[PDB]
mmCIF file of C-alpha atoms and ligand atoms in Angstrom:
data_model
loop_
_atom_site.group_PDB
_atom_site.id
_atom_site.type_symbol
_atom_site.label_atom_id
_atom_site.label_comp_id
_atom_site.label_asym_id
_atom_site.label_seq_id
_atom_site.Cartn_x
_atom_site.Cartn_y
_atom_site.Cartn_z
ATOM 1 C CA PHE A 5 8.005 2.161 -17.161
ATOM 2 C CA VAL A 6 11.380 3.051 -15.592
ATOM 3 C CA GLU A 7 10.082 6.445 -14.367
ATOM 4 C CA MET A 8 7.434 4.630 -12.262
ATOM 5 C CA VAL A 9 9.770 2.096 -10.619
ATOM 6 C CA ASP A 10 10.395 2.697 -6.918
ATOM 7 C CA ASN A 11 7.632 5.332 -6.648
ATOM 8 C CA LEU A 12 6.154 3.905 -3.424
ATOM 9 C CA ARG A 13 7.364 4.566 0.118
ATOM 10 C CA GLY A 14 6.111 4.029 3.673
ATOM 11 C CA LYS A 15 6.678 2.765 7.201
ATOM 12 C CA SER A 16 6.223 -0.911 8.085
ATOM 13 C CA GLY A 17 2.595 -1.591 9.093
ATOM 14 C CA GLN A 18 1.442 1.910 8.134
ATOM 15 C CA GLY A 19 0.710 1.493 4.407
ATOM 16 C CA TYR A 20 2.424 2.261 1.099
ATOM 17 C CA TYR A 21 2.062 5.759 -0.357
ATOM 18 C CA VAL A 22 2.606 7.445 -3.739
ATOM 19 C CA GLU A 23 3.399 11.110 -4.351
ATOM 20 C CA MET A 24 0.498 12.938 -6.006
ATOM 21 C CA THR A 25 -0.277 16.540 -6.838
ATOM 22 C CA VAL A 26 -3.614 18.285 -6.413
ATOM 23 C CA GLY A 27 -4.662 21.688 -7.775
ATOM 24 C CA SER A 28 -3.125 24.501 -9.809
ATOM 25 C CA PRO A 29 -0.263 25.110 -9.178
ATOM 26 C CA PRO A 30 0.477 21.501 -8.099
ATOM 27 C CA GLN A 31 0.354 20.810 -4.343
ATOM 28 C CA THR A 32 2.338 17.664 -3.469
ATOM 29 C CA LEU A 33 0.806 15.188 -1.007
ATOM 30 C CA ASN A 34 1.709 11.646 -0.042
ATOM 31 C CA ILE A 35 -1.215 9.375 -0.736
ATOM 32 C CA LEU A 36 -1.840 5.837 0.580
ATOM 33 C CA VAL A 37 -2.406 3.297 -2.197
ATOM 34 C CA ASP A 38 -5.543 1.345 -1.220
ATOM 35 C CA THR A 39 -7.001 -1.395 -3.411
ATOM 36 C CA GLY A 40 -9.595 -2.020 -0.651
ATOM 37 C CA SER A 41 -11.479 1.295 -1.032
ATOM 38 C CA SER A 42 -12.753 3.596 -3.769
ATOM 39 C CA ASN A 43 -12.499 7.250 -2.685
ATOM 40 C CA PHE A 44 -9.755 9.759 -3.362
ATOM 41 C CA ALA A 45 -9.746 11.521 0.008
ATOM 42 C CA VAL A 46 -7.138 13.997 1.239
ATOM 43 C CA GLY A 47 -6.507 15.844 4.522
ATOM 44 C CA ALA A 48 -7.804 19.369 3.866
ATOM 45 C CA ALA A 49 -7.657 20.943 7.348
ATOM 46 C CA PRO A 50 -5.073 21.083 10.171
ATOM 47 C CA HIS A 51 -4.556 17.872 12.158
ATOM 48 C CA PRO A 52 -1.970 16.941 14.834
ATOM 49 C CA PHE A 53 -0.621 14.155 12.571
ATOM 50 C CA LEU A 54 -0.445 16.271 9.379
ATOM 51 C CA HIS A 55 2.543 18.458 8.454
ATOM 52 C CA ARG A 56 0.600 19.669 5.416
ATOM 53 C CA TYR A 57 -2.796 19.471 3.746
ATOM 54 C CA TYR A 58 -4.719 20.268 0.558
ATOM 55 C CA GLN A 59 -5.324 24.031 0.460
ATOM 56 C CA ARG A 60 -8.425 24.398 -1.777
ATOM 57 C CA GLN A 61 -8.179 28.204 -1.704
ATOM 58 C CA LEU A 62 -4.683 28.037 -3.211
ATOM 59 C CA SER A 63 -6.010 26.193 -6.282
ATOM 60 C CA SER A 64 -7.295 28.187 -9.260
ATOM 61 C CA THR A 65 -8.805 24.979 -10.712
ATOM 62 C CA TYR A 66 -10.658 23.746 -7.640
ATOM 63 C CA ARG A 67 -14.473 23.315 -7.938
ATOM 64 C CA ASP A 68 -16.779 22.729 -4.960
ATOM 65 C CA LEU A 69 -19.455 20.046 -5.543
ATOM 66 C CA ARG A 70 -21.582 21.417 -2.670
ATOM 67 C CA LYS A 71 -22.008 17.954 -1.186
ATOM 68 C CA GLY A 72 -20.635 16.384 1.999
ATOM 69 C CA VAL A 73 -19.373 12.832 2.501
ATOM 70 C CA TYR A 74 -19.354 10.826 5.731
ATOM 71 C CA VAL A 75 -17.352 7.612 5.928
ATOM 72 C CA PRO A 76 -17.528 5.562 9.119
ATOM 73 C CA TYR A 77 -15.735 2.223 9.370
ATOM 74 C CA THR A 78 -14.647 -0.302 12.017
ATOM 75 C CA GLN A 79 -13.088 1.840 14.813
ATOM 76 C CA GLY A 80 -12.677 4.986 12.664
ATOM 77 C CA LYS A 81 -14.208 7.694 10.488
ATOM 78 C CA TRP A 82 -13.356 10.445 8.054
ATOM 79 C CA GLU A 83 -15.677 13.094 6.652
ATOM 80 C CA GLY A 84 -15.504 16.162 4.453
ATOM 81 C CA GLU A 85 -16.526 18.081 1.382
ATOM 82 C CA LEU A 86 -16.736 16.786 -2.183
ATOM 83 C CA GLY A 87 -15.154 18.741 -5.044
ATOM 84 C CA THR A 88 -13.043 18.327 -8.174
ATOM 85 C CA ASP A 89 -9.553 19.478 -9.083
ATOM 86 C CA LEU A 90 -6.606 18.653 -11.336
ATOM 87 C CA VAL A 91 -4.564 15.655 -10.186
ATOM 88 C CA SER A 92 -1.302 14.128 -11.365
ATOM 89 C CA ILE A 93 1.169 11.469 -10.246
ATOM 90 C CA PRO A 94 4.684 12.983 -10.687
ATOM 91 C CA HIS A 95 6.288 9.528 -10.828
ATOM 92 C CA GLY A 96 3.415 8.001 -12.803
ATOM 93 C CA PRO A 97 1.997 8.648 -16.255
ATOM 94 C CA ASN A 98 2.674 12.022 -17.859
ATOM 95 C CA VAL A 99 -0.987 13.090 -17.637
ATOM 96 C CA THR A 100 -3.232 15.371 -15.593
ATOM 97 C CA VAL A 101 -6.855 14.536 -14.873
ATOM 98 C CA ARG A 102 -9.832 16.231 -13.264
ATOM 99 C CA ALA A 103 -10.831 13.889 -10.466
ATOM 100 C CA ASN A 104 -13.242 13.837 -7.580
ATOM 101 C CA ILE A 105 -11.487 14.769 -4.342
ATOM 102 C CA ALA A 106 -12.979 14.394 -0.891
ATOM 103 C CA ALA A 107 -11.505 17.153 1.235
ATOM 104 C CA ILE A 108 -11.256 15.612 4.720
ATOM 105 C CA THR A 109 -12.252 18.238 7.272
ATOM 106 C CA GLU A 110 -12.855 15.946 10.290
ATOM 107 C CA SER A 111 -11.568 12.492 11.216
ATOM 108 C CA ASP A 112 -11.215 9.967 14.043
ATOM 109 C CA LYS A 113 -8.434 7.357 14.171
ATOM 110 C CA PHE A 114 -7.842 7.806 10.444
ATOM 111 C CA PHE A 115 -4.451 9.518 10.180
ATOM 112 C CA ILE A 116 -1.465 7.729 11.712
ATOM 113 C CA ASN A 117 1.233 9.562 13.680
ATOM 114 C CA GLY A 118 4.450 9.368 11.617
ATOM 115 C CA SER A 119 3.108 7.442 8.595
ATOM 116 C CA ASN A 120 3.965 10.414 6.343
ATOM 117 C CA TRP A 121 0.771 10.120 4.260
ATOM 118 C CA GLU A 122 -1.946 12.791 4.111
ATOM 119 C CA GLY A 123 -4.606 11.067 1.997
ATOM 120 C CA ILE A 124 -5.886 7.847 0.441
ATOM 121 C CA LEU A 125 -6.130 6.709 -3.177
ATOM 122 C CA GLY A 126 -9.000 4.219 -3.341
ATOM 123 C CA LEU A 127 -8.267 2.023 -6.359
ATOM 124 C CA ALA A 128 -11.283 -0.298 -6.031
ATOM 125 C CA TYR A 129 -14.530 0.036 -7.974
ATOM 126 C CA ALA A 130 -17.433 2.534 -7.941
ATOM 127 C CA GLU A 131 -19.781 0.081 -6.185
ATOM 128 C CA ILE A 132 -18.076 0.729 -2.839
ATOM 129 C CA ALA A 133 -17.429 4.493 -3.287
ATOM 130 C CA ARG A 134 -19.002 6.973 -0.840
ATOM 131 C CA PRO A 135 -21.518 8.546 -0.637
ATOM 132 C CA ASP A 136 -22.635 6.293 -3.513
ATOM 133 C CA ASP A 137 -21.545 4.607 -6.732
ATOM 134 C CA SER A 138 -22.169 7.803 -8.749
ATOM 135 C CA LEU A 139 -18.978 9.330 -7.339
ATOM 136 C CA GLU A 140 -16.473 8.304 -10.051
ATOM 137 C CA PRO A 141 -13.274 6.830 -8.514
ATOM 138 C CA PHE A 142 -9.868 8.238 -9.505
ATOM 139 C CA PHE A 143 -8.735 5.375 -11.746
ATOM 140 C CA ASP A 144 -12.020 5.424 -13.684
ATOM 141 C CA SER A 145 -11.480 9.155 -14.358
ATOM 142 C CA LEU A 146 -7.863 8.568 -15.376
ATOM 143 C CA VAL A 147 -8.820 5.901 -17.947
ATOM 144 C CA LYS A 148 -11.777 7.873 -19.366
ATOM 145 C CA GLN A 149 -9.885 11.182 -19.717
ATOM 146 C CA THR A 150 -6.542 9.818 -21.010
ATOM 147 C CA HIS A 151 -5.175 7.047 -23.211
ATOM 148 C CA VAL A 152 -3.867 5.145 -20.142
ATOM 149 C CA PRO A 153 -4.712 1.393 -20.421
ATOM 150 C CA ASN A 154 -7.165 0.117 -17.803
ATOM 151 C CA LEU A 155 -4.604 -1.717 -15.657
ATOM 152 C CA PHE A 156 -2.159 -1.017 -12.826
ATOM 153 C CA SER A 157 0.333 -3.228 -11.046
ATOM 154 C CA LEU A 158 1.867 -3.249 -7.583
ATOM 155 C CA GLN A 159 5.245 -4.484 -6.385
ATOM 156 C CA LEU A 160 5.299 -4.051 -2.611
ATOM 157 C CA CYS A 161 8.745 -4.717 -1.139
ATOM 158 C CA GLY A 162 9.083 -5.460 2.598
ATOM 159 C CA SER A 170 15.970 1.363 16.536
ATOM 160 C CA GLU A 171 14.153 4.673 17.140
ATOM 161 C CA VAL A 172 11.904 4.578 14.052
ATOM 162 C CA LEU A 173 9.855 1.996 12.148
ATOM 163 C CA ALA A 174 11.482 0.220 9.189
ATOM 164 C CA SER A 175 11.088 2.023 5.861
ATOM 165 C CA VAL A 176 9.424 0.167 3.023
ATOM 166 C CA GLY A 177 9.457 0.737 -0.726
ATOM 167 C CA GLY A 178 7.872 -0.476 -3.922
ATOM 168 C CA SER A 179 6.400 0.325 -7.327
ATOM 169 C CA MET A 180 2.984 1.193 -8.686
ATOM 170 C CA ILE A 181 3.065 0.880 -12.471
ATOM 171 C CA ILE A 182 0.040 2.647 -13.949
ATOM 172 C CA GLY A 183 -1.103 1.484 -17.394
ATOM 173 C CA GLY A 184 1.187 -1.503 -17.772
ATOM 174 C CA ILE A 185 3.344 -4.402 -16.677
ATOM 175 C CA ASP A 186 7.070 -3.925 -16.033
ATOM 176 C CA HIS A 187 8.865 -7.227 -16.736
ATOM 177 C CA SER A 188 11.876 -6.257 -14.586
ATOM 178 C CA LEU A 189 9.659 -6.428 -11.473
ATOM 179 C CA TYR A 190 9.055 -10.202 -11.639
ATOM 180 C CA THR A 191 10.548 -13.567 -12.578
ATOM 181 C CA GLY A 192 8.931 -16.715 -13.953
ATOM 182 C CA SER A 193 5.285 -17.093 -14.933
ATOM 183 C CA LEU A 194 2.465 -14.571 -14.501
ATOM 184 C CA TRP A 195 -0.723 -16.401 -13.434
ATOM 185 C CA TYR A 196 -4.229 -14.913 -13.550
ATOM 186 C CA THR A 197 -7.253 -15.366 -11.326
ATOM 187 C CA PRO A 198 -10.684 -13.923 -12.269
ATOM 188 C CA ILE A 199 -12.088 -10.872 -10.519
ATOM 189 C CA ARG A 200 -15.331 -12.473 -9.334
ATOM 190 C CA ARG A 201 -17.167 -9.173 -9.072
ATOM 191 C CA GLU A 202 -16.074 -5.581 -9.525
ATOM 192 C CA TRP A 203 -16.503 -3.961 -6.114
ATOM 193 C CA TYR A 204 -13.570 -4.985 -3.992
ATOM 194 C CA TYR A 205 -10.926 -6.863 -5.987
ATOM 195 C CA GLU A 206 -12.719 -10.094 -5.137
ATOM 196 C CA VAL A 207 -11.159 -13.450 -5.984
ATOM 197 C CA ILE A 208 -11.829 -17.142 -5.228
ATOM 198 C CA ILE A 209 -9.537 -19.407 -3.171
ATOM 199 C CA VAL A 210 -10.095 -23.095 -3.944
ATOM 200 C CA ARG A 211 -7.560 -24.791 -1.626
ATOM 201 C CA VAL A 212 -5.278 -23.941 1.282
ATOM 202 C CA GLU A 213 -2.133 -25.827 2.330
ATOM 203 C CA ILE A 214 0.123 -25.326 5.349
ATOM 204 C CA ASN A 215 3.501 -27.035 4.872
ATOM 205 C CA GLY A 216 2.074 -28.980 1.930
ATOM 206 C CA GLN A 217 -0.786 -30.269 4.058
ATOM 207 C CA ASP A 218 -4.312 -29.568 2.844
ATOM 208 C CA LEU A 219 -6.599 -27.951 5.455
ATOM 209 C CA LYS A 220 -9.407 -30.115 3.972
ATOM 210 C CA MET A 221 -12.218 -27.644 4.552
ATOM 211 C CA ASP A 222 -15.187 -27.021 2.309
ATOM 212 C CA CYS A 223 -13.684 -24.456 -0.053
ATOM 213 C CA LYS A 224 -16.582 -22.029 0.528
ATOM 214 C CA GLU A 225 -15.097 -21.578 4.013
ATOM 215 C CA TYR A 226 -12.006 -19.980 2.373
ATOM 216 C CA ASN A 227 -14.197 -17.292 0.808
ATOM 217 C CA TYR A 228 -16.687 -16.706 3.605
ATOM 218 C CA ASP A 229 -18.002 -14.125 3.074
ATOM 219 C CA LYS A 230 -15.536 -12.940 0.381
ATOM 220 C CA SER A 231 -11.813 -13.066 -0.459
ATOM 221 C CA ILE A 232 -10.148 -9.829 -1.563
ATOM 222 C CA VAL A 233 -6.735 -8.450 -2.552
ATOM 223 C CA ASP A 234 -6.143 -5.371 -0.388
ATOM 224 C CA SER A 235 -3.006 -3.185 -0.311
ATOM 225 C CA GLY A 236 -4.782 -1.272 2.498
ATOM 226 C CA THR A 237 -4.588 -4.201 4.933
ATOM 227 C CA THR A 238 -1.264 -5.133 6.556
ATOM 228 C CA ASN A 239 -1.990 -8.752 7.460
ATOM 229 C CA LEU A 240 -3.147 -11.918 5.881
ATOM 230 C CA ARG A 241 -6.654 -12.059 7.379
ATOM 231 C CA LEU A 242 -8.546 -15.332 7.456
ATOM 232 C CA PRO A 243 -12.175 -16.257 8.323
ATOM 233 C CA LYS A 244 -12.482 -17.538 11.925
ATOM 234 C CA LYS A 245 -12.637 -21.281 11.094
ATOM 235 C CA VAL A 246 -9.784 -21.010 8.605
ATOM 236 C CA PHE A 247 -7.699 -18.870 10.991
ATOM 237 C CA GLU A 248 -8.073 -21.473 13.771
ATOM 238 C CA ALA A 249 -7.088 -24.339 11.470
ATOM 239 C CA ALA A 250 -4.088 -22.373 10.157
ATOM 240 C CA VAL A 251 -2.840 -21.391 13.641
ATOM 241 C CA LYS A 252 -3.153 -25.024 14.777
ATOM 242 C CA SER A 253 -1.031 -26.169 11.803
ATOM 243 C CA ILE A 254 1.635 -23.420 12.175
ATOM 244 C CA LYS A 255 1.799 -24.127 15.944
ATOM 245 C CA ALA A 256 2.407 -27.831 15.267
ATOM 246 C CA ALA A 257 5.195 -27.179 12.738
ATOM 247 C CA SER A 258 6.927 -24.694 15.066
ATOM 248 C CA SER A 259 6.332 -26.722 18.260
ATOM 249 C CA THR A 260 10.033 -26.771 19.307
ATOM 250 C CA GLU A 261 9.288 -23.195 20.376
ATOM 251 C CA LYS A 262 6.599 -22.383 22.916
ATOM 252 C CA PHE A 263 5.308 -18.861 22.328
ATOM 253 C CA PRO A 264 2.777 -17.054 24.534
ATOM 254 C CA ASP A 265 -0.877 -16.818 23.448
ATOM 255 C CA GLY A 266 -0.199 -13.088 22.929
ATOM 256 C CA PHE A 267 2.054 -13.903 19.963
ATOM 257 C CA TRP A 268 -0.577 -15.856 18.012
ATOM 258 C CA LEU A 269 -3.029 -13.031 18.677
ATOM 259 C CA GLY A 270 -0.624 -10.476 17.169
ATOM 260 C CA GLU A 271 -0.402 -8.722 20.547
ATOM 261 C CA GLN A 272 3.193 -9.661 21.432
ATOM 262 C CA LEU A 273 6.600 -9.903 19.743
ATOM 263 C CA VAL A 274 8.876 -12.958 19.855
ATOM 264 C CA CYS A 275 12.631 -12.573 19.509
ATOM 265 C CA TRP A 276 15.839 -14.455 18.741
ATOM 266 C CA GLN A 277 19.435 -13.195 18.910
ATOM 267 C CA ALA A 278 20.418 -11.258 15.741
ATOM 268 C CA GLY A 279 20.580 -13.482 12.649
ATOM 269 C CA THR A 280 19.624 -16.726 14.430
ATOM 270 C CA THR A 281 15.869 -16.770 13.593
ATOM 271 C CA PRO A 282 14.941 -20.454 12.972
ATOM 272 C CA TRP A 283 12.990 -19.814 9.738
ATOM 273 C CA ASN A 284 12.877 -23.536 8.902
ATOM 274 C CA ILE A 285 10.582 -24.399 11.831
ATOM 275 C CA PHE A 286 7.832 -22.185 10.375
ATOM 276 C CA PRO A 287 5.837 -23.723 7.480
ATOM 277 C CA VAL A 288 5.063 -22.279 4.029
ATOM 278 C CA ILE A 289 1.443 -21.301 3.314
ATOM 279 C CA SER A 290 -0.088 -21.986 -0.109
ATOM 280 C CA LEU A 291 -3.276 -20.377 -1.349
ATOM 281 C CA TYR A 292 -4.697 -21.946 -4.528
ATOM 282 C CA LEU A 293 -6.573 -19.372 -6.614
ATOM 283 C CA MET A 294 -9.163 -20.205 -9.273
ATOM 284 C CA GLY A 295 -7.640 -20.141 -12.751
ATOM 285 C CA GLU A 296 -8.974 -18.503 -15.908
ATOM 286 C CA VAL A 297 -9.809 -22.034 -17.103
ATOM 287 C CA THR A 298 -12.792 -23.567 -15.210
ATOM 288 C CA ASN A 299 -11.144 -26.606 -13.587
ATOM 289 C CA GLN A 300 -7.677 -25.075 -13.164
ATOM 290 C CA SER A 301 -5.985 -23.348 -10.251
ATOM 291 C CA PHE A 302 -2.548 -22.003 -9.425
ATOM 292 C CA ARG A 303 -0.930 -21.571 -6.054
ATOM 293 C CA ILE A 304 0.856 -18.692 -4.483
ATOM 294 C CA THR A 305 3.179 -19.782 -1.723
ATOM 295 C CA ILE A 306 4.472 -17.444 0.962
ATOM 296 C CA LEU A 307 7.220 -17.845 3.550
ATOM 297 C CA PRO A 308 7.414 -17.046 7.275
ATOM 298 C CA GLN A 309 9.544 -14.107 6.076
ATOM 299 C CA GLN A 310 6.230 -12.674 4.835
ATOM 300 C CA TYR A 311 3.893 -13.582 7.711
ATOM 301 C CA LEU A 312 6.312 -12.740 10.539
ATOM 302 C CA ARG A 313 6.794 -8.942 10.449
ATOM 303 C CA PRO A 314 10.108 -7.555 11.760
ATOM 304 C CA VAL A 315 9.650 -4.974 14.537
ATOM 305 C CA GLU A 316 12.817 -3.376 15.927
ATOM 306 C CA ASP A 317 12.832 -3.225 19.724
ATOM 307 C CA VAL A 318 14.435 -0.398 21.710
ATOM 308 C CA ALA A 319 14.795 -2.408 24.960
ATOM 309 C CA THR A 320 16.687 -5.232 23.210
ATOM 310 C CA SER A 321 17.882 -3.804 19.874
ATOM 311 C CA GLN A 322 20.430 -6.628 19.629
ATOM 312 C CA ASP A 323 17.606 -9.128 18.973
ATOM 313 C CA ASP A 324 15.530 -9.768 15.855
ATOM 314 C CA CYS A 325 11.883 -9.480 16.929
ATOM 315 C CA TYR A 326 8.720 -10.393 15.033
ATOM 316 C CA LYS A 327 4.957 -9.882 15.046
ATOM 317 C CA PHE A 328 2.656 -12.677 13.810
ATOM 318 C CA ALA A 329 0.914 -11.040 10.826
ATOM 319 C CA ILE A 330 -1.915 -13.515 10.235
ATOM 320 C CA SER A 331 -5.140 -12.493 11.998
ATOM 321 C CA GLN A 332 -8.796 -13.450 12.372
ATOM 322 C CA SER A 333 -11.522 -11.962 10.176
ATOM 323 C CA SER A 334 -15.330 -11.879 10.345
ATOM 324 C CA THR A 335 -15.561 -10.243 6.913
ATOM 325 C CA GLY A 336 -13.756 -12.856 4.793
ATOM 326 C CA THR A 337 -10.214 -13.442 3.564
ATOM 327 C CA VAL A 338 -7.942 -10.461 3.086
ATOM 328 C CA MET A 339 -4.769 -10.913 1.088
ATOM 329 C CA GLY A 340 -2.995 -7.864 2.480
ATOM 330 C CA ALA A 341 0.555 -6.554 2.369
ATOM 331 C CA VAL A 342 1.737 -9.882 3.938
ATOM 332 C CA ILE A 343 0.603 -11.706 0.782
ATOM 333 C CA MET A 344 1.396 -8.948 -1.718
ATOM 334 C CA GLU A 345 5.015 -8.496 -0.564
ATOM 335 C CA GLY A 346 5.844 -11.934 -2.059
ATOM 336 C CA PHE A 347 4.588 -11.035 -5.507
ATOM 337 C CA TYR A 348 4.184 -8.696 -8.414
ATOM 338 C CA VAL A 349 0.429 -8.182 -8.525
ATOM 339 C CA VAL A 350 -1.363 -7.110 -11.699
ATOM 340 C CA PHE A 351 -4.772 -5.484 -11.377
ATOM 341 C CA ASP A 352 -5.951 -6.104 -14.920
ATOM 342 C CA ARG A 353 -9.265 -4.281 -14.816
ATOM 343 C CA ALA A 354 -9.646 -4.397 -18.628
ATOM 344 C CA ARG A 355 -9.740 -8.210 -18.587
ATOM 345 C CA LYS A 356 -11.419 -8.588 -15.143
ATOM 346 C CA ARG A 357 -8.490 -10.536 -13.676
ATOM 347 C CA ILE A 358 -5.651 -10.333 -11.150
ATOM 348 C CA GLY A 359 -2.172 -11.617 -12.017
ATOM 349 C CA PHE A 360 0.469 -12.959 -9.642
ATOM 350 C CA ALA A 361 4.163 -13.572 -10.304
ATOM 351 C CA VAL A 362 7.188 -13.986 -8.031
ATOM 352 C CA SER A 363 8.456 -10.520 -7.116
ATOM 353 C CA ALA A 364 12.021 -9.579 -7.987
ATOM 354 C CA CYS A 365 12.217 -7.937 -4.512
ATOM 355 C CA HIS A 366 10.582 -10.436 -2.072
ATOM 356 C CA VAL A 367 12.405 -11.509 1.139
ATOM 357 C CA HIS A 368 13.631 -15.132 1.183
ATOM 358 C CA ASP A 369 16.440 -17.479 2.292
ATOM 359 C CA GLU A 370 18.699 -19.984 0.485
ATOM 360 C CA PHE A 371 16.369 -22.953 1.149
ATOM 361 C CA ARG A 372 12.886 -21.668 0.221
ATOM 362 C CA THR A 373 11.316 -18.964 -1.948
ATOM 363 C CA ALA A 374 7.896 -17.386 -2.477
ATOM 364 C CA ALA A 375 6.415 -19.132 -5.508
ATOM 365 C CA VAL A 376 3.661 -18.975 -8.113
ATOM 366 C CA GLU A 377 3.007 -22.416 -9.593
ATOM 367 C CA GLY A 378 0.468 -24.071 -11.860
ATOM 368 C CA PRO A 379 -1.683 -25.308 -13.375
ATOM 369 C CA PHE A 380 -3.427 -27.629 -10.948
ATOM 370 C CA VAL A 381 -6.452 -29.277 -12.474
ATOM 371 C CA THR A 382 -9.374 -30.703 -10.525
ATOM 372 C CA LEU A 383 -11.999 -33.020 -12.021
ATOM 373 C CA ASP A 384 -15.563 -31.689 -11.513
ATOM 374 C CA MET A 385 -14.464 -28.642 -9.472
ATOM 375 C CA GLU A 386 -17.038 -27.316 -6.958
ATOM 376 C CA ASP A 387 -18.183 -23.681 -6.719
ATOM 377 C CA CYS A 388 -16.070 -22.189 -3.900
ATOM 378 C CA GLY A 389 -17.762 -18.771 -3.994
ATOM 379 C CA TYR A 390 -20.031 -17.588 -1.198
ATOM 380 C CA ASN A 391 -23.241 -15.683 -1.908
ATOM 381 C CA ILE A 392 -23.718 -12.842 0.608
ATOM 382 C CA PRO A 393 -27.314 -12.862 1.974
ATOM 383 C CA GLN A 394 -29.261 -10.057 0.290
ATOM 384 C CA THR A 395 -30.525 -7.361 2.666
ATOM 385 C CA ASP A 396 -33.720 -5.437 1.990
ATOM 386 C CA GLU A 397 -31.648 -2.214 2.110
ATOM 387 C CA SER A 398 -29.418 -3.425 -0.735
ATOM 388 C CA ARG A 399 -32.283 -5.003 -2.720
ATOM 389 C CA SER A 400 -34.274 -1.742 -2.586
ATOM 390 C CA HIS A 401 -31.518 0.216 -4.389
ATOM 391 C CA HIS A 402 -32.299 1.192 -7.974
ATOM 392 C CA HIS A 403 -29.335 1.091 -10.347
ATOM 393 C CA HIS A 404 -29.963 3.473 -13.251
HETATM 394 C C1 3UX B 1 -8.780 -2.435 5.378
HETATM 395 N N1 3UX B 1 -8.798 -1.017 5.017
HETATM 396 C C2 3UX B 1 -9.002 -0.004 5.892
HETATM 397 O O1 3UX B 1 -9.219 -0.076 7.103
HETATM 398 C C3 3UX B 1 -8.936 1.321 5.132
HETATM 399 N N2 3UX B 1 -8.674 0.834 3.777
HETATM 400 C C4 3UX B 1 -8.601 -0.456 3.797
HETATM 401 N N3 3UX B 1 -8.356 -1.282 2.719
HETATM 402 C C5 3UX B 1 -7.809 2.187 5.693
HETATM 403 C C6 3UX B 1 -6.532 1.610 5.915
HETATM 404 C C7 3UX B 1 -5.466 2.379 6.453
HETATM 405 C C8 3UX B 1 -4.214 1.751 6.689
HETATM 406 C C9 3UX B 1 -3.670 1.774 8.004
HETATM 407 C C10 3UX B 1 -2.435 1.113 8.229
HETATM 408 C C11 3UX B 1 -1.797 0.442 7.153
HETATM 409 N N4 3UX B 1 -2.328 0.408 5.911
HETATM 410 C C12 3UX B 1 -3.502 1.040 5.687
HETATM 411 F F1 3UX B 1 -3.982 0.981 4.427
HETATM 412 C C13 3UX B 1 -5.711 3.735 6.796
HETATM 413 C C14 3UX B 1 -6.994 4.307 6.587
HETATM 414 C C15 3UX B 1 -8.054 3.546 6.031
HETATM 415 O O2 3UX B 1 -9.299 4.138 5.826
HETATM 416 C C16 3UX B 1 -10.236 3.545 4.925
HETATM 417 C C17 3UX B 1 -9.796 3.806 3.456
HETATM 418 C C18 3UX B 1 -11.632 4.179 5.169
HETATM 419 C C19 3UX B 1 -12.777 3.302 4.595
HETATM 420 C C20 3UX B 1 -12.639 1.794 4.942
HETATM 421 O O3 3UX B 1 -11.316 1.325 4.617
HETATM 422 C C21 3UX B 1 -10.282 2.039 5.283
HETATM 423 NI NI1 NI B 2 -35.890 3.846 -10.073
#
């Protein structure tokens, strides 16, 4: 899969994008890779933050579906017109597919100034597509129309401009040059988000000792479309307390722990060893087994280059509070080669050949850990009448 290696780019904190083409002849756009959503949606009108957009009128193969789509979310929205057109990934498989495309005609706090992406590739399942689960997501169309195996994998690699990032999205396979050591699999609990189950959490080898359902309240997901590691309120508080204790030689302002303020050291003198490792134990394929993924402060402290003191190394705390469950975002994924094995309803983790580390510690993937009479750590989301009333033909 050499032709797919290094096909992702982006700016730190602003998402990873892949080059895609839409229409006939091919119109190149940079598209955010988002395992936390399920629509293929592209800028299709002028916007202050867009240098270019999908020009439907320039495409001989474009078909209008005569249906609108409205997608509000926490502090943002995009909306537009549904249609289909021919789509390819120049540095992906050598195929062209007819996919659903949402042509974004209006948006609020969706596009990001300087991110260099013009659309989003929702790689999650039909259940969370908009307007409804009948709108076939891109990857579903790719698999159905081609011989491409039902699997993709992601290797996300971490003074005037933001730091550039890079990585790889391997479509249809696993590239063994992108990882070292063992590849460990956790079940996809349900096909909507890429939902998984966390059975144990340790901070510097110390168990948080919470009921494991707290770790997955109200879900735990793997999301390339989230920057941070996001933790449920109770878990976040316990984690911050533990990380504070380990790093107590340094007294940071409350702003830092809230992700609202940078902390700095003189170039190259960052005391990495005072910040603890964080281990998340994920449910194994075998009932009473788990494996752990361990990440370093190099992952959860994001470098942000300052203009006022460019001689210092400055960092944002990239663990944040959630009210919608655990989110293993770019913070987690940057340590690992992550395999979204849809065919076998599982997610694989292995140590990434590109992750940032020092000479004393490394990001790790270790197992098995077996537990006698293991509890059910999954949370069951209360069923609303709205949801219950849906018919699923
Ligand atoms: C959590 N999350 C989002 O907020 C989201 N995708 C995910 N997964 C998302 C993330 C980013 C982003 C911004 C900065 C860095 N990285 C990104 F992915 C940009 C847009 C965006 O829009 C949605 C697709 C619209 C529907 C709800 O989800 C959104
Ligand atoms: Ni019915």
